[PDB]
Structure 1
Amino acid sequence: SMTEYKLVVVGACGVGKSALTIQLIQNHFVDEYDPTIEDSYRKQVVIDGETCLLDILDTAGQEEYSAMRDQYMRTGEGFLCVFAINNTKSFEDIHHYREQIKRVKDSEDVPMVLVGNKCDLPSRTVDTKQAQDLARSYGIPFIETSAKTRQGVDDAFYTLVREIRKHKEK
């Protein structure tokens, strides 16, 4: 049999939400920035021996249109919360995204993964310990990724599915 998971990718503008999604779906990376309005993708994978369909909603970094963003969060089962390791403000923004998800879904325990993207770059401003400490404070995993080299891309999405499955056991 299989299962299906609604995954939602959120985070500040330009952190690599789409590049991570496109690596997962289409196995390529481009330097050109194509700013998102909204896109959805589907992919069949096997995670821990269990086949599933991933429904990935790639959201824009903006946080206006609360009516639409609240609906994203209501429908979503797990959330990739992405920042870029060379953008301190995008790391500081993570708290707001998490608070909105908890509010909309009426829960302190929502499946989430903290993703520190662009780890290929030499311009780091957020160190790993900072991110691990933040993820620890939330009780969620932290995954370092590069959409450019594909480092950690599968891990980030697969870990999120593992988080959903753990939550469903409760």
Structure 2
Amino acid sequence: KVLLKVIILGDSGVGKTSLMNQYVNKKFSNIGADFLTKEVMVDDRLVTMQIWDTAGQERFQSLGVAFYRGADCCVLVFDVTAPNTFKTLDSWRDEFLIQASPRDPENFPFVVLGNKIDLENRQVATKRAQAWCYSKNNIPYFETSAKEAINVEQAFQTIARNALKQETEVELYNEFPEPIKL
């Protein structure tokens, strides 16, 4: 059973928790988010995707190091109607690199999600975001709506694929056996 650890980063209120719930449970709410798992297909291969939620620890920027360990893909989210959340994207990416300290940093899989497109007053332009993602080693960009379930399943397809590639490279270098789980 190949297992992929995905974490969702970004400022409070952009929809990180709703995006996780929409993907996995195909539901959207109007109170105990932790981490969900889903058996997904990545190019004809069945894999277990484990998606970790910040449990609100980002509200006051208090996510500790243990949250980041072993991550195979880091999802960065911003609210398309809130330019402020788009501007912090660089800080969260830098924070992931410092906290997770992955091998071959510059090639780590980041995926950017411009969420809440269902809202009629967007303020961050698609072109402007695509450009930013491009200036960071051509990071894949997707515009989503956790509420109207738009592009969510599609975005997680590349997240899964990119996370599988990373974890596979990680296992290739791993000389140690599997650790014990209680």
Q: Which ranges of 4 or more aligned residues in structure 1 deviate by more than 4 Å? A: none
CA–CA separation in structure 1 for the residues paired with 2:140 and 2:59: 24
In the TM superposition, what whole-angstrom CA distance separates every residue of 1:67-126 from its partner, at most 9, and x where no partner exists? x2x222223111110001001010001111000111223322221100000011111110
CA RMSD of superposed structures (Å) = 1.8
TM-score by length of 1: 0.87
Q: How many corresponding residue pairs? A: 163
Equivalence for 1:142: 141
CA–CA separation in structure 2 for the residues paired with 1:113 and 1:146: 15
Q: Residue 169 of structure 1: CA displacement?
A: 5.0
Aligned to 1:122, the other structure's residue is in SS state coil
Aligned to 2:41, the other structure's residue is in SS state strand
CA–CA separation in structure 2 for the residues paired with 1:92 and 1:130: 11
Within 5 Å, which residues of 2 pair with 1:125-140?
A: 125-139=123-137, 140=139
CA–CA separation in structure 2 for the residues paired with 1:105 and 1:55: 16
Aligned to 2:13, the other structure's residue is in SS state coil
Within 5 Å, which residues of 2 pair with 1:63-142?
A: 63-66=60-63, 68=64, 70-106=65-101, 107-139=105-137, 140-142=139-141
In structure 1, stretches of 5+ residues that fail to align are none
Q: What amino acid is aligned across from residue 49 of structure 2 in structure 1?
A: L
Identity across the alignment (%):
31
In structure 2, stretches of 5+ residues that fail to align are 171-182
Structure whose CA Rg is larger: 2
Name whichever structure is richer in strand by fraction.
Answer: 1
Q: Pick closer, same or farther for the CA change 1:166–1:53 going to 2, 3 Å.
A: closer
